[PDB]
């Protein structure tokens, strides 16, 4: 069937078309949808979509919502897809794991908008879009294909442009040595505690975070003789056995 239009737990089905294949004549690329939010400003008025296509980035979303604003004439301005980790490359962050700079879901795409009435308009438009996709697969809203996959990720296999990574290492070292030096002098002169105390720092240590995590990671000679009661106990043990 294609006549299904809304899932069990509120998910809205939004399928897509397929191009011309040299061995197939189709035109379905399924996808779910959900409105949601969290407390932070990166995830305001946002939409879950589960089963993202292979490399459907921001530009692909622009073309899709441009076709949508051609069809239903709604309000739609997309900016970014948080948690675009469909490969398996950016789950952990080593830099935030062992550094000071830039301190601190599954296969989804969380896409936020510019207005709550915009996500309301797009969500109700999307429900009607799911219904028309259920009824007819020919009069359907569709997202085209100019393929940044073809521009970037088929031809990996490439010399890197020297001016690009040279200005990148220049800018990254320029901000990194600055923040490292200011953290070093900040831990080297951090004398005042609010109650009288002076923090022992050690020589040439570079960070308050470093000594903090070190002190988190870092978490007698009695005699058997020479006392009267102990030599009484010893001679009592010798008397007994």
């Amino acid at each position: 069937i294609e006549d299904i239009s809304a899932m069990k737990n509120g998910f809205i089905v939004v399928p897509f078309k397929l191009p011309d294949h040299k061995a197939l004549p189709a035109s379905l690329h399924f996808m779910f949808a959900k409105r949601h939010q969290s407390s932070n400003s990166n995830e305001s008025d946002c939409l879950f979509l589960v089963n993202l296509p292979l490399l459907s980035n921001i530009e692909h979303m622009k073309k899709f919502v441009g076709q949508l604003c051609g069809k239903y004439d709604t309000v739609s301005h997309v900016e970014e897809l948080l948690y675009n980790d469909e490969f398996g490359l950016h789950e952990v962050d080593l830099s935030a794991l062992t550094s000071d700079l830039m301190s601190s879901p599954r296969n989804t795409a969380l896409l936020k908008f510019v207005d709550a009435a915009s996500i309301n308009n797009c969500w109700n438009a999307l429900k009607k879009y799911s219904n028309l996709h259920a009824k007819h697969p020919n009069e359907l809203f569709e997202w085209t294909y100019t393929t940044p996959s073809f521009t970037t990720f088929v031809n990996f296999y490439k010399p890197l442009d020297i001016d690009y990574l040279k200005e990148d290492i220049h800018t990254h070292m320029a901000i990194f040595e600055q923040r490292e030096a200011q953290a070093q002098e900040d831990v080297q002169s951090s004398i005042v505690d609010e109650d009288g105390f002076t923090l022992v720092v050690g020589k040439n240590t570079k960070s308050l975070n470093s000594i903090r995590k070190k002190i988190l990671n870092k978490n007698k000679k009695a005699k058997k003789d020479f006392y009267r009661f102990q030599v009484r106990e010893r001679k009592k043990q010798e008397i007994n056995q």
């Binding site: 397929l18 292979l54 490439k158």
Partner: protein
């Protein structure tokens, strides 16, 4: 010696039924010898009437060659009541259960009044024996047919020990009284009385048969037929001496029948010669003698393992053939003498026969070597191999035992057609030195083989396939026409194990040149003749030698044995081999100057690559850096000689082109803290060295490359140097801060990403730290194990055709291939591509996962892992996979000295791929053991084996990549690829992608995208298996057993969905294949389902 005694008792307990199944067959022989006691006798007869007396019946008479003409008939025959002796093996009760069955020794001895003082000549005593067996077996079949038990029991003629001098009676059965459930035969023999004569007409150093050459098999056969009761008396007195003899002989029986050393003969062209009863006899002589001072060698007080290791040590390091043998007397010391008889020999001074004379010098050589290596593998204490010493049928598959095999298909014809068919001698002078045509032919083949090859072969063996000792009653011989000849072999198989060091030396330096032509120079001239020459070598000496035009599709030993048989045995004996020629060029033929004419042990492509690397090495040292290079060292596959194709210059499209060299700088403290900034500083240093390289040395070139194998840091950048010699190198900077940065990350990370980050650290120390030690150890070992580089090349080819290289890595394949090279426990160190490759396949079919950790100690022959480290590896294994149930992700466990963790190279591959490898090895070994080794068998093994599982997607890049991959396709026109291999790096560098192939990166990104729901395998070396044009690749792959039927959807089921039911969705195959095709519209052409 705490677990080995328990292993000995369990090996006994493998067969301990010597009471139940022995009683019925012994009452069968009780009835038999009662019938033999009541056989009525006969008086003297004539040959010229017993010939018609057997002509008119159906039973006929056998004969030693030839039948007696009545001109020489002056012997007086008899048919008496024989004293019957139920002796030997099951008299000692040394039971073994065999599919072909043991046999009780039972002898009809000869009465004293049908022999005389001259029973040692002209085989009329053996003719008497033939006619006496003929009438006694006719009498016994008559008595069986009147007693009416013919329907289950039957009787056959057979040779004793496959020897035509003594035909014997094979009493067997068939399908209330039918015997079918134990050893399927007994053997009735006929023998001569004991006190006959004295050793001067009884030694193998006499002759009285007409032309004094030696009569070795003659006076061995008749003397063992006459005087073999002191053996039994001595056997039972040693039985009364100690009790370990029966366990000792079943130990030796299992040993020698897994070695294939049955009691037939080696003189007949068969493996064997040595026998288990000869092992018992030599052991019983070694419990009193064997020393230089005629010492007690084995005390009769200790248990079976000590005397077993004693007799193995004595026939391992002390010589019996060449320099020394042991004389002895059963009825008083036994003396080791230092002179040799130039035969496998031990002497008797109370019997005066030589008990080892059933074998030749070649079989004694291979037995002494087997004894030496089994002494070596029993002496070692760090690891026990009782299951490798007594639980391996190395004789079930014969080509596993020997390095290479050839066939001699010769239609020689008739016994009188000898002269024009074969170029060897003919007469009674040779027919008294030997026995028959095949006997002196096999001896001639041994002599011409060892003089044709010299010390280019370790050991030589020869057998006659198509031999049939089971000749019927009514026929006077095995009178079989075995495909061109009237002799008992279909063809003649010659097997060699070869010395792999000088196995392919293209000249064979014979004797030196002088004015007085010496006898060995005359021998060499008459032996080679038209292809001998005398040359000066570069030092200045002059030597007779023979040049050999070497080749890649053959070893030169093929052409040498071809010419040295077609000059000596027959000028029409066709040598047929095709297995070597079939998967000796399954290695890709590297498009080099004359590389088809070069050998396969040549490594000159690797050495040319290392010469270009030394040029780059000097250039990268003598420049100047702000923190100079401490140590630059290669780690690559060409540097460890295990690249699939040999690296030809300018070959872009091979994925094993860019070898990786690493460089470590000085230990400076000014490295930054976190991983992105130190990796960015590594990019800064690489940018500096490529800037100065393009500044000062314009003949090289450089281009950068992102890396992605070390995960969660996208900023790891290598550079790649394109050198003017034609090779490319991938430079990786290592720092001292790296592994402590990763340990910092491991320590401070959250408590649920710990095994994930440990997998990242595993990939890091597999690529950077320990891979240096890995390539050092195997590059050092690949000079004493010579065939290691071709067997790794062949194994990588075979695994690429069977579609595993996408998941599996190189280091598993390399340690798998180095396992039979360093652990020869059932076999030898492999000296041929065939023997090595099927050794690897046999091992990984044998390979368990739950109770077979793969421990290696990478060391040259004659350091290792110590005992405490071996116990530590075992403890690591047992706690590792008792915490692990059955390997949900940790399938293979491969430990060495370089890595005691074991999981360093195997972590990551999926259970479907690992199970596919093990099941495919099982398929290959049963296919080889039943369908037989053949060229069509080898090609059907090296079929791709799609075994269609849920999809096959067929690729097409627009260029057949043989030209840019650098392998000629066995094209007969060398020029058409000499002008086609683009021997110049391109000016623009953004064309490298479209002259390369992207299919491995596509299948890798697709596998890590859909890693939970379907796995994807591919081919990656497209030139070696992508067709003759070299343009084809597939993307095959299994769907998970979870995702077979539909599954209810949630927020985290992690799959492309086809929602048709409102809850239970399925993966939309058309959508996933169509996004694959959208990813590869320029790449894929075809899709096949099912």
């Amino acid at each position: 010696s705490n677990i080995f005694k328990l292993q000995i008792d369990e090996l006994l307990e493998q067969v301990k039924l010597k009471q139940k199944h022995v009683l019925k067959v012994e009452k069968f022989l009780h009835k038999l010898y009662d019938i033999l006691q009541e056989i009525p006798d006969w008086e003297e007869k004539s040959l010229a009437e017993v010939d018609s007396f057997f002509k008119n019946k159906i039973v006929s008479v056998p004969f030693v060659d030839p039948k007696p003409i009545p001109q020489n008939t002056n012997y007086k025959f008899n048919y008496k009541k024989p004293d019957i002796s139920l002796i030997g093996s099951f008299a000692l009760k040394a039971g073994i259960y065999q599919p072909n069955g043991s046999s009780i020794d039972t002898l009809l001895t000869m009465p004293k009044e049908l022999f005389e003082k001259k029973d040692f000549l002209n085989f009329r005593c053996l003719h008497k024996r033939s006619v006496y067996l003929a009438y006694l077996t006719h009498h016994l079949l008559i008595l069986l047919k009147k007693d009416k038990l013919d329907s289950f029991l039957q009787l056959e003629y057979s040779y004793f020990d496959n020897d035509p001098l003594l035909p014997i009676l094979r009493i067997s059965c068939s399908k209330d009284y039918n015997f079918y459930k134990t050893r399927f035969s007994i053997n009735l023999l006929i023998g001569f009385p004991y006190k006959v004569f004295e050793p001067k007409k009884l030694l193998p150093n006499r002759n009285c048969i007409r032309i004094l050459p030696a009569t070795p098999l003659y006076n061995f056969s008749v003397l063992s037929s006459s005087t073999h009761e002191n053996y039994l008396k001595y056997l039972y007195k040693t039985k009364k001496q100690t009790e370990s003899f029966v366990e000792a002989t079943v130990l030796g029986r299992l040993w020698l029948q897994q070695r294939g050393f049955s009691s037939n003969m080696s003189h007949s062209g068969s493996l064997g010669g040595f026998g288990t009863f000869e092992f018992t006899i030599l052991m019983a002589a070694l419990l009193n003698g064997g020393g230089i001072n005629s010492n007690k060698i084995l005390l009769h007080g200790f248990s079976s393992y000590q005397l077993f290791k004693g007799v193995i040590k004595y026939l391992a390091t002390m010589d019996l053939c060449h320099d020394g043998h042991l004389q002895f007397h059963s009825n008083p010391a036994s003396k080791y003498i230092d002179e040799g008889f130039q035969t496998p020999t031990l002497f008797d001074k109370s019997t005066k026969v030589n008990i080892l004379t059933k074998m030749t010098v070649s079989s004694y050589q291979i037995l002494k070597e087997y004894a030496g290596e089994t002494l070596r593998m029993l002496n070692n204490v760090v690891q026990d191999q009782f299951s490798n010493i007594f639980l391996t049928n190395i004789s079930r598959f014969d080509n596993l035992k020997y390095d290479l095999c050839y066939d001699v298909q010769l239609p020689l014809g008739k016994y009188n057609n000898l002269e024009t068919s074969l170029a060897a001698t003919f007469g009674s002078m040779e027919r008294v030195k030997f026995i028959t045509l095949e006997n002196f032919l096999a001896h001639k083949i041994t002599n011409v083989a060892r003089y044709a090859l010299g010390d280019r072969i370790k050991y030589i063996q020869i057998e006659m396939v198509g031999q049939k000792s089971d000749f019927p009653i009514t026929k006077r011989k095995v009178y079989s026409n075995t495909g061109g000849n009237h002799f008992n072999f279909d063809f003649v198989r010659v097997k060699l194990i070869v010395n792999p060091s000088e196995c392919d030396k293209l000249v064979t330096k014979g004797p030196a040149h002088s004015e007085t032509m010496s006898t060995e120079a005359a021998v060499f001239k008459n032996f080679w003749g038209i292809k001998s020459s005398l040359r000066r070598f570069k030092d200045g000496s002059i030597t007779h030698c023979c040049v050999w035009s070497t080749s890649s599709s053959e070893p030169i030993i093929s052409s040498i044995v071809n010419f040295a048989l077609q000059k000596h045995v027959s000028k029409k004996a066709q040598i047929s081999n095709e297995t070597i020629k079939k998967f000796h060029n399954f290695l890709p033929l590297p498009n080099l100057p004359s590389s088809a004419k070069t050998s396969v042990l040549n490594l000159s492509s690797f050495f040319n690559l290392k010469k270009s690397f030394d040029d780059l090495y000097k250039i990268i040292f003598q420049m100047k850096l702000p923190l100079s290079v401490k140590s630059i060292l290669p780690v690559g596959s060409a540097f460890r000689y295990t690249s699939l194709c040999q690296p030809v210059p300018f070959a872009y499209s091979d994925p094993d082109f860019f070898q990786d060299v690493i460089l470590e700088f000085e230990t400076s403290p000014k490295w930054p803290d976190e991983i992105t900034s130190l990796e960015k500083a590594k990019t800064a240093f690489l940018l500096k060295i490529q800037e100065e390289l393009s500044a000062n040395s314009s003949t090289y070139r450089s281009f950068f490359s992102r890396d992605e194998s070390i995960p969660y840091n996208l900023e790891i950048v290598t550079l790649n140097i394109l050198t003017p010699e034609g090779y490319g190198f991938k430079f990786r900077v290592l720092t001292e801060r790296d592994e402590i940065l990763y340990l910092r990350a491991i320590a401070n990370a959250r408590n649920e990403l710990k095994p994930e980050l440990e997998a990242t650290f595993l990939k890091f120390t597999a690529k950077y730290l320990a891979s240096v030690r890995h390539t050092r150890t195997l590059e050092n070992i690949s000079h004493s194990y010579q065939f290691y580089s071709p067997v790794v090349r062949l194994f990588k080819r075979w695994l690429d055709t069977h579609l595993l290289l996408g998941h599996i890595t190189d280091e598993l394949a390399e340690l798998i291939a180095i396992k039979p090279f360093v652990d020869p426990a059932p076999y030898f160190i492999p000296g041929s591509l065939e023997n090595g490759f099927l050794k690897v396949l046999k091992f990984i079919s044998q390979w368990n996962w739950k109770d077979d950790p793969l421990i290696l100690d990478l060391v040259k022959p004659e350091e290792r892992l110590t005992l405490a480290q071996y116990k530590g590896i075992q403890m690591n294994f047992t706690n590792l996979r008792n915490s692990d149930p059955n390997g949900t992700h940790l399938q293979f466990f491969v430990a060495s000295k370089n890595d005691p963790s074991g999981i360093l190279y195997s972590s990551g591959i999926p259970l479907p791929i690992a199970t596919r490898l093990t099941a495919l090895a099982k398929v290959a070994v049963n296919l080889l053991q039943t369908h037989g080794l053949n060229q069509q068998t080898i090609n059907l093994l090296f079929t791709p084996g799609l075994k269609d599982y849920d999809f096959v997607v067929d690729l097409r890049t627009p260029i057949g990549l043989k030209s840019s991959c650098g392998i000629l396709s066995a094209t007969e026109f060398k020029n058409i690829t000499n002008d086609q291999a683009p021997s110049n790096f391109p000016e623009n560098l953004n064309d490298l992608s479209e002259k390369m192939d992207p299919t491995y990166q596509l299948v890798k990104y697709l596998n890590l995208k859909y890693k939970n729901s379907l796995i994807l395998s591919s081919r990656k070396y497209i030139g070696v298996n992508g067709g003759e044009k070299g343009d084809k690749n597939v993307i095959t792959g299994l769907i998970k057993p979870l995702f077979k039927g539909a599954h209810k959807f949630r927020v985290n089921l992690d799959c492309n969905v086809k929602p048709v039911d409102d809850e239970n969705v399925i993966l939309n195959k058309e959508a996933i294949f169509h996004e694959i095709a959208a990813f590869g519209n320029d790449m894929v052409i075809n899709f096949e389902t099912d």
